[PDB]
Design a protein around this nucleic acid. Structure first.
Lengths: 97, 361, 82, 101, 117, 97, 117, 86, 101
DNA sequence: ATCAATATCCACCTGCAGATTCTACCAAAAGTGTATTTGGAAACTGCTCCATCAAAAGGCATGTTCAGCTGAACCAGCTGAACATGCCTTTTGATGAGCAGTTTCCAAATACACTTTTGGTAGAATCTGCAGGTGGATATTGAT
DNA sequence: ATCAATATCCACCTGCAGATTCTACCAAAAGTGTATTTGGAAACTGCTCCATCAAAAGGCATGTTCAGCTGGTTCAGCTGAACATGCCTTTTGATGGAGCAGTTTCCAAATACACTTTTGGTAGAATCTGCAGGTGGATATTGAT
């Protein structure tokens, strides 16, 4: 009867997996690893963005701050593709306000 | 290519004066590469700051030192060049110009804040301006014999205009910052172009502008402007900026520039501001070079050389470089005859003349 | 001799862990040293986990507690929440 | 057949290396590790319980750290023109990393 | 009353990861007093791309082993074979992952073995 | 009306230095080092307390949270002495009310 | 009506460090929505104790070298000669800090001179 | 002139300087090839720290690399530097 | 007596070790390090300016890092029954610590 | 083993370049008075964990044994150490302009209150990879 | 008169633990509004950063000698890896109890917010004085006899 509602990123990870490899499944334990990975990167990027905000005496976390956080955490060519994807996402979102 | 064929072709009158001038200029460039030899040089205490050519005498050159020393150097005489010692702290002669009437005097603008008329023998005749207050000095200076006017600028942006006997009616501020150069046109005698650190050049007509900085035009510049010099014919204004750009403006539509000539002459606290100069009897522009790691240089050799361009086409035509003088040639002023070039390297004054003509018996 | 429960980490188990790590020949004295190293590491992790659980007014060392304890040492662990 | 098939020293070791590198099941036994963890806990505080997941996490972290230390120890051992891991190698590996504690 | 048919901010941005959820997690978490509209979209896109990369490499690893389900072992191979990801997750231990095959050359024996009798 | 004000921990560090060694002086660079040390340790303890408040779904930082943060961060016997000093300070403060 | 004389929170707790300043820095900095009354005093006390320990060791080092003033070197020796402080600040560099004069034994000249041919 | 002192670069760190650093670390005897590897490692470390600092300065829209930028860049990697601000 | 006083190999090495561990002066000269730092800054952005304090911080950090690395390297060299540091010692130290090499 | 060149330890003696020590003040702290939350007591459920029983059965403690490894002892050959000396290269003091560092505003942005509805999930029915079990089929490493 | 223990490795087949998909519910997310707030653009300004040419003072790049470390080559001896055996500790199941980790609800200390009064750091001058740099000796290091 009584039970809380756990919030996870399982369904969205499954959707992405279906996108990249339609005929493939993921175990529950792999799903746990993916959930931990998503949460960890969220915390890393958010923390670096928050520091970047406070360091410049700013109080709002804008897209520029997350851009710099991504530039700072990720290595090599991973940063380029990720920044491009984020830029496309924000451009699409704002173009259809 | 047709080195000698053109002059005879002219002599029949088929060629107009401009084509003859073009040919003579080409001859001048062709001979310029034999000038490479440095005939003479001379030391004195500190960095050289001013260079002035004797209007008539073709061997007398005047150079000032950052410490207030003035040297009259007539080449070939070995007369122990006249030297006037200075204070040495803030006596820098920011601008030197002979008195057109009596060549034994000169108009010298100094960091003391005293643009003065002084005889080369040493005695000071008369002081034209003195703003006192220490953090107010004079930087610019120009004299027009035709109208007998003397113009001098200040560090704050207020320029002064004085007669050769005094009675200034001026001191109206025209710039928000230091006024670097003021040039009185040779052809006309009433309109003046001034370049300042405000990053703007303003052209005035002293006979008609008195209404609270009423300027004929404003010439915006991306960076500070060091010099704004007119062609001897007075039809072109050559403007030198501080990072890398040279602009030429014609009497037709003063605002827009004829050509942008990229050239590295970056600014330095301890370097005499680099100034391009006009060739008295041709359409050539002489200016030194100051290499920059960030500037775009296609050639594999990045050397400190005195470049010569052409006023109209805006392309390089010749370069001067002799090892053993690899310093930076801040100033470069041609002899009025156009034969000798005098350069102001740091602590050394260079003359790029050549030997004489045929020998007698 | 008292077992002390540290001998519960048997010698063959140490051999297996060493084999997976790329070694080929084990000197005799490696066993005591590895037992000591494991004891120190476990002491650190359990101390941090116990501090966390005590602060929460609990009596069960949750999995999240050990995961957080490993985060501090720079040994992040994936698979048990986060 | 005077003697049976006797693999030379090293070959069985290499086979075991392959077998345990191709696998992922835990190498430490469950009950001994549980008892050791509970001993340390009772040392730090009395009457403490453990979720099975917590003990699993401890096992995973300990095994991972130990295998990493063994990789570094082997790297050090080869440096010394040897193929044997000795305590001095573990000491050096822990010292360089900064794990003196 | 208009009540335009609600479209998720994820759909507006063409993303699969939620955009509202990241905005909520940023608001609650004391990362900063104010969170802008563009921040959640950018962060969701970044997370989606990273997940896509790791999952694609893991799936490629699975196909090489004739396995159609991604188990924890595969993610370890995906992360520890690609240098950039290894840099990103160089200080993370994957549960039930194992280690990459690696045997130092000094250990491998002499190669003399061929029919000679 | 420009008036710069750079807040720092120099005066308090000097007071403590005189308390613990009256006949001693501190160089400006030494005072900068002590400033950096104080700020670093403050950030560490405060961030650990913030993290603890989040895990337990607690919306406030109380003395218990700082105590647990100190226990987590500081090593060895420096933890016992620090916690004893903190408990003494808090009991002295409350007893003054 | 009374407005008792203002007494500093530092005096109440008997700490040389500013309790009010730590409160202000906790509020501005977003460590949590609310800051309890007793947290700032505890944190100030902890900072004071650690500062006192470091400065005491630094002064002892200074007296060792016959200097009345603490220069950056003397802090380095204090931090590096005490185990607990060395561990708390094991990943930190001190401007003009120097290093301990430790020299490995094997490098020292071999005084084990015995019978030789 | 094309001075380029042996590389115009890391080769400007004279051999006695690497010897001095090694001696401060306790090194007694140094092999010949150590110098080039030392220059390489220094170059990599400097590249990483400078990249972090330059990202920080670019974010604030500044034309200077402030000292606090280098401090925070080092703190990112876990080499906090005391004595330049915090 | 005509033979000139010649210090035997090593007696200067230890003296330099003591001298440079007892001091704190920066060992890398200002100008070469400044030029190096500025050159590496070109690749990431053009027209950058460095505060003197920023370059001093970079010098301090680089010298500290190199001193630490040389300490760990010398420790590796001893473990190999040697007194001379060679490049492979640097490579092993970096591998163990966690850097690329 | 005397001795004979250095280095380093001392030990006075200035003077000046930073440190202490006076100020004024204003921004931040402290003192009342309400509002408004936390979080902690107190009472539940029922979920997970402690044990504790079977029975294996798979692992390990346990002795031979001998094959390869690890450490000595010299040894030749070379390569870093040490000094000697001119020659760079770094270091540094001469009296402009850029830009970091603060103020001050809005227009744009984000937040804050209710409302509608909808993807989010509690758990339940299905499918179904593949773990595990036979069987060959080679394959490697070690014995004439 | 190089094949054999053990392995690896593939091919195939079957059932179920355990993923996938599918009902339903309802907690957050949008949507529509009204209210704060505050990021970036003018504006300024005062510290300080860019980098040349003399002049000079020190380090150092370049060549000898040559001491000693250092890879290499033999050699014992030791020792641990491999294998055979029989006990025995550890896994799978259990079956409950039950301790207490979560889940509701209530309200009273606790802290926020806000103003208004107060005084404590802090930015400048003043001046006070460790000690860095000299000057000399006295002693210990070190070294080839």
């Amino acid at each position: 009867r009584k039970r809380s509602r756990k919030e996870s990123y399982s369904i969205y990870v499954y959707k992405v997996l279906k996108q990249v490899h339609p005929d493939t499944g993921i175990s529950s334990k792999a799903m746990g690893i993916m959930n931990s990975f998503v949460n960890d990167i969220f915390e890393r990027i958010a923390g670096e963005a928050s520091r970047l905000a406070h360091y410049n005496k700013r109080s709002t976390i804008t897209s520029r701050e997350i851009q710099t956080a991504v530039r700072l955490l990720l290595p090599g060519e991973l940063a380029k593709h990720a920044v491009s994807e984020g830029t496309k996402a924000v451009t699409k979102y704002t173009s259809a306000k | 290519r047709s080195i000698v064929r053109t002059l005879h072709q002219h002599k029949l009158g088929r060629a107009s004066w401009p084509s003859v001038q073009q040919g003579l200029q080409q001859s001048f460039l062709h001979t310029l590469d034999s000038y490479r030899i440095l005939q003479k040089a001379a030391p004195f205490d500190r960095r050289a700051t001013s260079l002035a050519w004797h209007p008539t005498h073709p061997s007398t050159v005047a150079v000032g030192s950052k410490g207030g020393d003035i040297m009259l150097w007539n080449f070939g005489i070995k007369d122990k060049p006249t030297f006037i010692k200075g204070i040495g702290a803030g006596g820098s002669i920011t601008g030197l110009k002979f008195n057109p009437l009596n060549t034994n005097q000169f108009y010298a603008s100094s960091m003391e804040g005293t643009t003065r008329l002084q005889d080369f023998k040493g005695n000071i005749l008369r002081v034209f301006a003195s703003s006192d207050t220490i953090n107010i000095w004079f930087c610019s200076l120009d004299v027009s014999a035709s109208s007998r006017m003397v113009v001098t600028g200040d560090n704050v942006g207020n320029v002064i205009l004085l007669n050769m006997d005094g009675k200034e009616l001026w001191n109206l501020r025209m710039h928000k910052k230091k006024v670097t150069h003021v040039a009185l046109n040779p052809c006309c005698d009433w309109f003046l172009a001034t370049a300042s650190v405000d990053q703007t050049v303003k052209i005035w007509d002293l006979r008609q502008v008195r209404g609270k900085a009423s300027f004929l035009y404003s010439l915006p510049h991306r960076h500070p402007v060091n010099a704004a010099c007119f062609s001897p014919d007075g039809a072109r204004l050559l403007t030198t900026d501080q990072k890398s750009e040279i602009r030429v403006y014609s009497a037709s539509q003063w605002d827009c520039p004829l050509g942008l000539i990229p050239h590295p002459h970056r600014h330095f606290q301890h370097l005499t501001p680099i100034k391009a100069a006009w060739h008295p009897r041709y359409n050539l522009i002489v200016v030194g070079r100051y290499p920059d790691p960030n500037f775009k240089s296609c050639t594999p050799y990045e050397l400190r050389t005195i470049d010569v361009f052409d006023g109209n086409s805006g392309k390089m035509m010749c370069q001067l470089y002799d090892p053993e003088s690899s310093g930076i040639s801040s100033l470069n002023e041609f002899n009025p005859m156009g034969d000798t070039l005098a350069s102001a390297m740091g602590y050394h004054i260079l003359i790029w003349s050549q030997e004489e003509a045929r020998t007698r018996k | 001799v008292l077992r002390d429960n540290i001998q519960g980490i048997t010698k063959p188990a140490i051999r297996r862990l060493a084999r997976r790590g790329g070694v080929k020949r084990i000197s005799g004295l490696i066993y005591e040293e590895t037992r000591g190293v494991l004891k120190v590491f476990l002491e650190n992790v359990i101390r941090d986990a116990v501090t966390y659980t005590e602060h929460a007014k609990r009596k069960t060392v949750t999995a999240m507690d050990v995961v957080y304890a490993l985060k501090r040492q720079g040994r992040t662990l994936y698979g048990f929440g986060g | 057949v005077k003697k049976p098939h006797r693999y030379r020293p090293g070959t069985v070791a290499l086979r075991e290396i392959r077998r345990y590198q191709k696998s992922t099941e835990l190498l430490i036994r469950k009950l001994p590790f549980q008892r050791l963890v509970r001993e340390i806990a009772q040392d730090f505080k009395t009457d403490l319980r453990f979720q099975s997941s917590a003990v699993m996490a401890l096992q995973e972290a300990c095994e991972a750290y130990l295998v990493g230390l063994f990789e570094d120890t082997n790297l050090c051992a080869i440096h010394a023109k040897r193929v044997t891991i000795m305590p001095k190698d573990i000491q050096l590996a822990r010292r360089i990393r900064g794990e003196r504690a | 009353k208009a009540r335009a048919k609600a479209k998720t901010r994820s759909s507006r941005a063409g993303l699969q990861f939620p955009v509202g959820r990241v905005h909520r997690l940023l608001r609650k978490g004391n990362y900063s007093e104010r969170v802008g509209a563009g921040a959640p979209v950018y962060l969701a896109a970044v997370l989606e791309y990273l997940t896509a990369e790791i999952l694609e490499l893991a799936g490629n690893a699975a196909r090489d082993n004739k396995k159609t389900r991604i188990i924890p072992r595969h993610l370890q191979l995906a992360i520890r074979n690609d240098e950039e990801l290894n840099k990103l997750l160089g200080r993370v231990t994957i549960a039930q992952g194992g280690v990459l095959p690696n045997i130092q050359a000094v250990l491998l024996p002499k190669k003399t073995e061929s029919h000679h009798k």
